[PDB]
Amino acid sequence: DLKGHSVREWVSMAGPRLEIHHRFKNFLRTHVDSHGHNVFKERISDMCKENRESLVVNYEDLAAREHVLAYFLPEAPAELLQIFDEAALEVVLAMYPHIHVRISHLPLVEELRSLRQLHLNQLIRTSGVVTSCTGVLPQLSMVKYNCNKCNFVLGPFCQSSCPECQSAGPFEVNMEETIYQNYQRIRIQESPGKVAAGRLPRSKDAILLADLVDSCKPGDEIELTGIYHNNYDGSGFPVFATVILANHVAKKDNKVA
Amino acid sequence: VIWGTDVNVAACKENFQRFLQRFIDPLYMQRLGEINVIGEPFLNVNCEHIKSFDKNLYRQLISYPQEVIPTFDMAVNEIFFDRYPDSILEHQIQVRPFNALKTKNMRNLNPEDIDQLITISGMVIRTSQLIPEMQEAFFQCQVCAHTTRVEMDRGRIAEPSVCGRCHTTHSMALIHNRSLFSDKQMIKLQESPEDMPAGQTPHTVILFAHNDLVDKVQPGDRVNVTGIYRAVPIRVNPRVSNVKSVYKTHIDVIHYRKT
Amino acid sequence: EVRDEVAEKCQKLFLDFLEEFQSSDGEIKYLQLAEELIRPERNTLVVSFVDLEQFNQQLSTTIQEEFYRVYPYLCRALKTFVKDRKEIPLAKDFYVAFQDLPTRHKIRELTSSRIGLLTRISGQVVRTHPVHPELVSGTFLCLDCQTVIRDVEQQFKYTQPNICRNPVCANRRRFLLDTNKSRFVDFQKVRIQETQAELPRGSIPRSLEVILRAEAVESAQAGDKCDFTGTLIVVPDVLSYRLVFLACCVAPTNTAESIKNQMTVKEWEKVFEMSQDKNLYHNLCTSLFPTIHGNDEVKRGVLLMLFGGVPKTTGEGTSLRGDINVCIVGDPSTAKSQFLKHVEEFSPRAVYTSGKASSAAGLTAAVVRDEESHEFVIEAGALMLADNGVCCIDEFDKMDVRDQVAIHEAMEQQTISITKAGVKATLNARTSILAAANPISGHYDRSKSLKQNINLSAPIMSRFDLFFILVDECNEVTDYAIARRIVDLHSRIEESIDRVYSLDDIRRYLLFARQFKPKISKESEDFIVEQYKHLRQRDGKSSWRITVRQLESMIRLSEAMARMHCCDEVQPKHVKEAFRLLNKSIIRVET
Ligand SMILES: Nc1ncnc2c1ncn2[C@@H]1O[C@H](COP(=O)(O)OP(=O)(O)OP(=O)(O)O)[C@@H](O)[C@H]1O
Ligand SMILES: [Mg+2]
Ligand SMILES: [Zn+2]
């Protein structure tokens, strides 16, 4: 149910994992809202009209209807996000034989200077101004090579002579992992006017994979919600650069409201 | 006597003490007193003084430096505990002889000089940052954190491959910071061009300064370096134990004289 | 499950010290310090080493001897102390920073025997690398046996688990890193070099790499001199190892009353006589420049630069320059480089450099790729190295346009905002600049305006407080006197100088005078107003016109002259002398 020992460990458990999955799937039908229009049915119909595989979920509704579930969303973002994605995919297939779920309306909004290690590997919403954006980079793959004639695996090598035995063999791929199967990299800095004069505006890097790709333009003030987590980067072993995995994006109309 | 030499620890120490006390240009006692206040525990001695005082002792020192220098160190420490018997020093005095055998014809050097003290004049070409070399490796078990130590494992470190409290499989990893290190600086020094008669191919040598005397010579400095000639094997492949029949040779410096 | 009795005892004693030790007020100071630490961005708590030494000498000795071994346990003790006290976030990194260490070693003295023990060093930052998260306690899962390896600490390298967790399985090669579960900490690689004070003459300085983390990451900016309290450690490099000083705390290197109390009785008496010594101006000028003849005005201006005015920051966050900038445009020879060399030699914190320098920094901060790391690093330039000091730049007329614009920005805003290759920084640089230049064609044409005589851009010229023109007079008496000076110097190898005050005495007097911040009296205010009225009325023809920038330079020089005598208020004497100096420095076209 709840109140385990660690939120990440608690969600990882298969029992509670399927419990939360079933509860969310049921909520995908029960939540007709006071309007009684079956909000989730409306969202499913809108998505399937254009087949956007992009679902919008309001944190307020989850918090009010469930409470505990919305409470656990911040601490275990990836797990519950995958649960919601699979639930939405199953619902869409049932109604219309992957679905990405994007959250919004996060209660607390933190500035770039306001986020620290306490917020690492958690979902958070911030307000920033885009500064630079790249193309739709194909993929970032980390390749680890089993050594040739030596019990050792060469360190991760990013893509997109042994340290001990000095073997000259070409080596063979011990393990290759793919990350960001199709991604766009953007940079967001503190919106002008919120900087404390002398202080240089803070900047952070966000990655938009598959969904939300090319959903922003340089120079656009956006309220970005995403998982602020560490991860590999394009650079001995690869450098671990902190980034924001973008879960949802918005636009602040008129740039001042 | 130590095997394959003409050296007696007691007699050699007594002769060195006599040389320290009975000598005429006594300077050694003067600089011993100077070290008292300075605290600098390094007694530099010109070997030519020993040669003049006792040629036999000079020959013995040159032939077997590694085995003889400790005796001189012990004698100097005993004297320092005799004169100024009360004093404080982090480590007892050390002796660093110099200017003994000017076989500065580096191009003309022979394997007969292996493990023999020699002084050579030349200009240092390159150096390197002080290298910390292990002397007492510290290991901790990944399973039970069983702490253990391996001391002076003849250069390499003997991996236990097995723990001692849980006696699990090879899981005890070395802890660099918890270990103990010593300073070793590498220098590449070129033979002095003037001394070479032909100079068709200027000669170069590699020097190692150990535990002290590090960074005391900047690049391009023309100095006389006195140290022990050394030859060490080179392994054909690090994995295999085979060694080349031809040894690469270097110098373990004992004293520097700026000139 | 092996318990380090030393570590546990140190943890217990450290927690006891935290929860019992109290200030002179009788209250636990560290309780309030931690209460302050609860706020965000405050994850490092400072601790006074002398205080804990008094609380437990044995504990302090053990920590000093085995600081690195016990540091994690000290952090755990801090975590326990803060968690149960107040509403602090359940899980965020905490650290302990140590200070007040009497033992100040030199970079030369850092030997392998000191590895792992706490020590304090003093150096000057040279370059600063970007911040980077780094895994400290990694967590992996074995692919074959799908068991999560946890807390596999890595010693500053990509150290995978030696063998699987399961005794049953022995994959040993296909561990998968759990990024989310892995523990990361933000590290910044800085490079420091021996400060000129400790640097032996003609000896290459020792470059030492240091690692900054937690609150200290951004504390030290490129080009500044700082003292680091930490512990030297070894790091494997592609059994090779290299030294790096992991610094727990970073502080700036080293009031008038404080200095006077610290100053010796004889030194304070000498300084007091100096302050009470009338005509100290010319006396000090002559003492500081023995191997020179004439050019009394140049020496006066250089001395005023050495003293400097009172910097001011407005309520609107605008910084008003407190120090002054001097340029010397001179015919070939004429001792310009000699002036700069004297200034550099006398004054610590003064750095001599030339406009022909080809360093990647290029006389100012730059961004350069590291040869090994290949990551862009902010490298401090000579101008930065002169922070809160003096930069004697020779061949100022020959500077490159890139360095020219950089220097223009530096002298305008007193700070350099450098942004490139994705890196960005704002390096403070409050440095008095003494430039030497030659007239176009070599010889100064006194019938032409200064602009026509030098190639410097208009903004650079405008932002200079004083220009001193050194024309090679054909007068026989002047040449005879110059020959007399040079020949007497070369024959009387020494003792030819007549220093009414010793160089060390001048240095200590300058340090004492710096502590004063002279104010402007209403009488001084109106006198300055009237002097500027006269200067404006002059309106000539002068080489360069007179603007409010000249008024700012005038007030800064008046502040410096007030600082000369250490009087805390301005008097008309200082204002009139400054007016004389600035007006004389103006040269009219002789056509
Ligand atoms: N007015 C002067 N009084 C005394 N000595 C002087 C004077 N002018 C020049 N000298 C002497 O001239 C000698 C040579 O001058 P120096 O090399 O310092 O010139 P410089 O200013 O660097 O010239 P430039 O930059 O135009 O090439 C100096 O040792 C200095 O002693
Ligand atoms: Mg010159
Ligand atoms: Zn290998």
Ligand SMILES: [Zn+2]
């Ligand atoms: Zn064990």
Ligand SMILES: [Zn+2]
């Ligand atoms: Zn396994």
